[PDB]
């Protein structure tokens, strides 16, 4: 689809069999969710944003279906304020930015 | 033109009578840009994300041209490591997100 910006480009997801909301973001390098249970292993990770870093748990190669669309990449969860949709998984389901 | 999201998607942006790099971010409600000396009245604000709150000083009707097209609304200045485009200014320039 085409989405406007008008609105916060917020879409359904689904991962670990689970629907949640997330905010489709340019701006973001990597896709980080709201604390939550995923089953695999995980390794500590830290990343940094505009108010500071936050301590992430790290699951890679975990199938994630943004808007209808598959992927399967790297996720991290933690204490961030919003579900967002990072660089790393738009170019998986063709995400691009036009005007 | 279109942008894909295998890199950050930085663009040169012009404010001021001066010419910077500034990030295309969709998952920004607000336009957050380098610490700058500008002009006229501002207001106190705070922006919170990953890692928490900064402050930033509010400017109102601010002009800025992205890529070409222009674009007038409110900047959030401030100790950011990057200069942010959001979506008060993206929609400005008809940017849309499509896949
Ligand atoms: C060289 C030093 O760089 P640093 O690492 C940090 O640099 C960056 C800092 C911020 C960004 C942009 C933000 N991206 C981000 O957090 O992404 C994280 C995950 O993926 C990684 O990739 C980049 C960073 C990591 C995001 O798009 C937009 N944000 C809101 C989101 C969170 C939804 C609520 S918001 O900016 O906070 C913001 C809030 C309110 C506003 O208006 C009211 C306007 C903007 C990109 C790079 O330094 C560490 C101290």
Redesign the pocket.
């Known amino acids: 689809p085409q989405i406007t910006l008008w609105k916060r480009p917020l879409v359904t997801i689904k991962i670990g069999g689970q629907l949640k909301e997330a ?1 489709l ?1 340019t ?4 896709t ?1 969710l709201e604390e939550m249970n995923l089953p695999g292993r995980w390794k500590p990770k830290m ?4 108010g ?2 936050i301590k992430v748990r790290q699951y890679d190669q975990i199938l994630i279906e943004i808007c209808g669309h598959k992927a399967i990449g790297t996720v991290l969860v933690g204490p961030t ?2 579900n ?1 949709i ?1 660089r790393n998984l738009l170019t998986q389901i063709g995400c691009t930015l036009n005007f």
Chains 1, 2 share one sequence.
């Open positions: 905010l973001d701006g973001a390098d990597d980080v990343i940094g944003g505009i500071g870093f304020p919003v967002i990072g």
